[model samples]
Target: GAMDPEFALSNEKKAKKVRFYRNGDRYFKGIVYAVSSDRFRSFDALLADLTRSLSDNINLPQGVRYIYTIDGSRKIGSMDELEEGESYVCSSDNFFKKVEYTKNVNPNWSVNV
Candidate 1:
């Protein structure tokens, strides 16, 4: 009952709109760039493109990763489909880590190596 526009972009354009934003870029936030779907087939490599490309701007950042929002702490794989107009927060990978959680268990359980 809801497959109308399902195949609308089955063969969409290579480049799509995306916004990179955070607390600051060159001490401020927000920048737009076109991401070609076929640019880099690797997520790790893909990020380098965005970070280095932003050399003309941003806060003291080493690299950048995207986030839908604060609560949108989701991970997208290498071949996942990225939606057009998906403005992502290009914040440093700061999901959260109070400490190095060393898991523990024994015998019929699990343990950190």
Candidate 2:
């Protein structure tokens, strides 16, 4: 069935789109930025810029959501395909190396390590 879209939240709104997912119906709202092909410092700069821009008095569309990651599943062709609160890891290097690198690079973002 179809559910009515929520009035995407501002810090002001009582209910907004959520981020972290523990299971069903229990999602923690947060900010997520997809890391680009650029280096870590560059990604950090971009995140800062986006945060500065969006964290103000703005109204997101109903059901609209955002998430950040070291990188996304698809290339940076379009933002519409992005999934909220979900990050798509890339195969930049060996799996273990990637894991270690991702951990060191993004200490704040969630990771297995």
Candidate 3:
């Protein structure tokens, strides 16, 4: 299927950088795989992309919940948007560990280092 142009542009231009964390442990860090057609022109759009990307990456078991924070300092709020060179973490009670991304780990998505 043809990819959404908006999503492709967001991935290419906006290139939202987010890191996932579980129990304070860093896991994955990369450009957010935004599938939505909405252009990332604001924090709201970026947040949605991050949320969706994280959810898709980490498939937690049923009944658990997920929470997010920026730079390991402030938990993500309604008006939160990921910074370009900052780390972001996501975790639950006891399911996942941590995922972090900053400064573009790899643009080609070849390695998960």
Candidate 4:
């Protein structure tokens, strides 16, 4: 008989950078794994990593706590449902914004040779 010793976690492409938020108003960053055997199969796992990232403050906010999808849907299941590099936020507040790029427009600007 062998005990599953969690062995290890990180490989090469297993680590994914994720964006975190609170009620979608505040933002943070953290890393998530694709699948770590029996270690990364819970929604609480994602929350823990984020706590180690942005919400390092030693206090948890009470009241309807949950995860909100990009489309404003509610989530209460395994993190395997979440994809890599996706943006997510905890809580029940809306009005979220994402990273956007501005188009450069210069009407006939001449550079001196």
Output the number of the TM-score-best candidate.
1
Provide the RMSD of all predictions against the true structure, rounded to 1 decimal.
14.3, 15.3, 7.6, 11.5
The numbered model that scores best in lDDT is: 1
Tens-place lDDT per residue, model 2, 1-113, is 44664644433312111122111111222344443333224433533444443343223221223322333323322334334434332222212111222322333454321
Global lDDT of each candidate: 0.47, 0.31, 0.43, 0.43
Model 3, runs deviating above 4 Å? 1-15, 24-66, 94-113
Clashes of each: 3, 4, 14, 0
TM-score of 3: 0.36
TM-score of each: 0.50, 0.22, 0.36, 0.46
lDDT agreement of model 2 with the native: 0.31
The TM-score of candidate 2 is: 0.22
> Could you tell me how far off, in angstroms, the CA of residue 56 lies in candidate 2 after the best superposition?
23
**Candidate 1 on 1-113: residue-level lDDT in tens?**
55577555466446655545443432333456556646765656666776776543434266566433312455444425455555455445445322211123112211111
Write out the backbone clash pairs for model 1: 25-28, 25-58, 26-58
lDDT per residue (tens digit) for residues 7-108 in model 4:
464444453333444542332332232334255546676556544444433222432245556545556466666665555555533343432211132212
**Model 4 lDDT-worst window of ten:** 101-110
Off by over 4 Å in 2: 1-73, 88-97, 100-113
